[PDB]
Design a protein around this nucleic acid. Sequence first.
DNA 1: ATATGACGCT
DNA 2: AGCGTCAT
Length: 424
Amino acid sequence: ATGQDRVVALVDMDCFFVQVEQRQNPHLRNKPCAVVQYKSWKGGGIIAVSYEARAFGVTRSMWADDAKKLCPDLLLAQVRESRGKANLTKYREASVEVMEIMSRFAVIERASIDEAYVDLTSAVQERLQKLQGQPISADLLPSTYIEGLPQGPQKEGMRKQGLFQWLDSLQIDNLTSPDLQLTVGAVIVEEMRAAIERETGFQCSAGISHNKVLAKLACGLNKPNRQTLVSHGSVPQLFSQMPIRKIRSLGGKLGASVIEILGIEYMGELTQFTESQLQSHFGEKNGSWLYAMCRGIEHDPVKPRQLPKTIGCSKNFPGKTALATREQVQWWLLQLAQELEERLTKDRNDNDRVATQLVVSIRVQGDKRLSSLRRCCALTRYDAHKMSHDAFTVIKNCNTSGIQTEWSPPLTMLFLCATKFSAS
DNA sequence: ATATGACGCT
DNA sequence: AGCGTCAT
Ligand SMILES: Nc1ncnc2c1ncn2[C@H]1C[C@H](O)[C@@H](COP(=O)(O)NP(=O)(O)OP(=O)(O)O)O1
Ligand SMILES: [Mg+2]
Ligand SMILES: [Mg+2]
């Protein structure tokens, strides 16, 4: 079995937060520009970067002041600030706009604020028998790249040349040629992407392949404003120089042990190993997953979920701003709870459901662990004061100070999350 | 002094 | 459950 039964696509917005600000502020269009959070510490932290500005080496996580050094024409748009914290509402709403449109073509799984996976298998079947064996016209694929093509014996001319070899080798006879199915999926994604641009003004990229992992890999091969098809046949060469860390779920500790333990560098080298070999190295689940994946085979299904299982608000208090007093802790819990009550009310009305669990998370000054304590209490009413007061209770026994007016050690992070939803 | 949401392990 | 891992 070759892991070619499904057509899966990943759609990801190009420099999402920038496009949202550029739609709103025409003066930012087609300029080096970036979106910044806060302002006081070193101009604010950069969180999204137009492609014009990336050409100067401006990146996410860079301070705005350091970014202006790399690029002094850089324009900045500031994230909105409510009750003393970053407020991402504009971008969540833009995301819903984009998800609604995508939903009209197939069932989607929201994977982040700006991307969704799409299972196109069923829509591919439909469009196939409508064609009645009609060949696929390169007219229908004006922004599609075929990975690994052209091959054998100017940016856009190279694209068409690869696209011509793909079609000129296609087998439109067999209505289950996996390569034909990917080509038809790619035709739908062009329609989906034109509709998103038409109805929002947002441009996006997309990957089309047989599973989530290849779709996501393909999406980033030709950003921005292009889509890439990765066929099962292109996987051996693609993977032969693909660093292991580029693959989703291997960008961290597991991927680094794969490199260290096996002494390899690229995804294609995993094929030498037996599945049993890989299970003893990395456990039974990772070994099986890896054995299949280095052959381009992956089974994670596209889950029909476009809303979330959790709604959270958090704020970091780094350095001098760490929370030292009880009354400081209570004020910020109030602020978090107020924004949280706002989003929960919106979610109970628009999507018809109610949370039953409140999770409270904190980080103390000196703990490397991104969260230090994580406790849960009942959630019965969408009332900020009640939520904020209950969060304090759950954490108040963690102020290790005999002075009760004081909070020690200082808190570096407050996090309030609502979960365990039920239909309402 | 790089705000969020999913899922795995035990 | 609470923690860890990984993602954008
Ligand atoms: N580590 C992070 N932390 C917080 N917000 C982030 C983030 N990474 C991204 N965002 C925010 C800002 C981002 O705009 C948005 C989508 O994340 P991406 O798709 O990873 N990056 P973009 O869409 O900007 O560029 P392109 O896709 O063309 O590479 O979510
Ligand atoms: Mg994006
Ligand atoms: Mg993204």
